[PDB]
Amino acid sequence: GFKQDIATIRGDLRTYAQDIFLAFLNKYPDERRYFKNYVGKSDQELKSMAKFGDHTEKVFNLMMEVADRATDCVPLASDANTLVQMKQHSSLTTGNFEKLFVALVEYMRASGQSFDSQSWDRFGKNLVSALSSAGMK
């Protein structure tokens, strides 16, 4: 289920983080604009970039922490606030977060693994509602 999924992703965090983030960037090309150093690079080129692996891993590490702290897939208000006031997120709207989770859910469904995709869909929706109440447009 949801808790096992967190253990699965953490077990090979580097791999899952890179593949899911690329799935996100290629599904929503407009989103790459927020990462100027990823522009004009193929998937393999990015997988070779030290900063790419490190950053994506850090993004997913925090996502897993928030997911582990949640109750019944509902994130803590404090975690939502933390994501909203991070300077790196200053110019983001809930729309950007919805797209990430759509790509994440689609990735899980398309993989071979037995992820609890329904819970992740729920988690993403609840997280987006939480960002909204936290003041994100």
The CA-based angle 131-2-12, given to 5 degrees, is 95
Binding mask 48-77 for its own copies (x = CB under 8 A): -----------------------xxxx-xx
- For residue 113, give every residue at least 6 positions away whose Cβ sits within 8 Å of its Cβ, in sequence order, or none: 8
Residue type, 75: P
Alpha-carbon distance of 31 to 96, in angstroms, equals: 8
The least CB distance from residue 64 to its own copies, in Å, is 19
For helices 117-133 and 94-110, the axis angle rounded to 10 degrees is 170
Binding mask 118-137 for its own copies (x = CB under 8 A): ----x---x--xx-------
Binders of ligand HEM in range 39-98 (CB under 6 A)? 55, 58-59, 62-63, 83, 88-89, 92, 96-97
55 binds ligand Oc1ccc(I)cc1 (CB under 6 A): yes
86 binds its own copies (CB under 8 A): no
For residue 102, give Cα distances in angstroms to 36, 57, 98, 108, 125: 23, 19, 6, 10, 10
Q: Which residue is nearest to ligand Oc1ccc(I)cc1 (CB)?
A: 55
Residues at the contact surface with its own copies, assessed by CB under 8 A: 71-74, 76-77, 122, 126, 129-130
